[PDB]
Amino acid sequence: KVFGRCELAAAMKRHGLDNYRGYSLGNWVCAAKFESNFNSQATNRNTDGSTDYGVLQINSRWWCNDGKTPGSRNLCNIPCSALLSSDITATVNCAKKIVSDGNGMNAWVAWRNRCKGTDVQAWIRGCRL
């Protein structure tokens, strides 16, 4: 499903991403735009045989099990297919796990390049929230 900007922001808000760990809602929406263009079915195969899934392009090498990635790690304890749903529950629970573990949102390179240090309030402009 291709979410609309405000629709995804409202869904992420309902799931408690608003200022989770000090990362405002706009940071999350900005990240999703540049990672998947708000497309929940987005998948990106990598040379290492890993695939990035969903709105936040969560990698199968360490975060979810897709049955075809070397290493067999699944830190979020979910099948990668759960990240392709129009229901963002699993994506949010997993992203909260990622952001708590390493260099915050720096885990998303798209976020680092186009979001970090910029006025992200603009991402939730005109949204009822």
Q: What's the DSSP call for residue 53? A: E
Q: Can you tell me which residue has the tokens 């952001």?
A: 99
**CA torsion angle for 97, 101, 107, 111 (degrees, to 10)?**
70
Query: Which parts of 1-129 are beta strand (E)?
Result: 43-45, 51-53, 58-59
Which domain covers residue 113, as residue numbers? Answer: 1-129
CA distance linking residue 60 with residue 2, whole number of Å: 21
Which positions are annotated as active-site residues?
35, 52
Tally the residues of the chain.
129
Cβ contact 6:128 at 8 Å: yes
Question: Resolution, in Å, please?
Answer: 2.0
Number of domains in the chain: 1
Q: Domain with 93 in it: what CATH number?
A: 1.10.530.10
Rg (CA), the chain: 14
Experimental method: X-ray
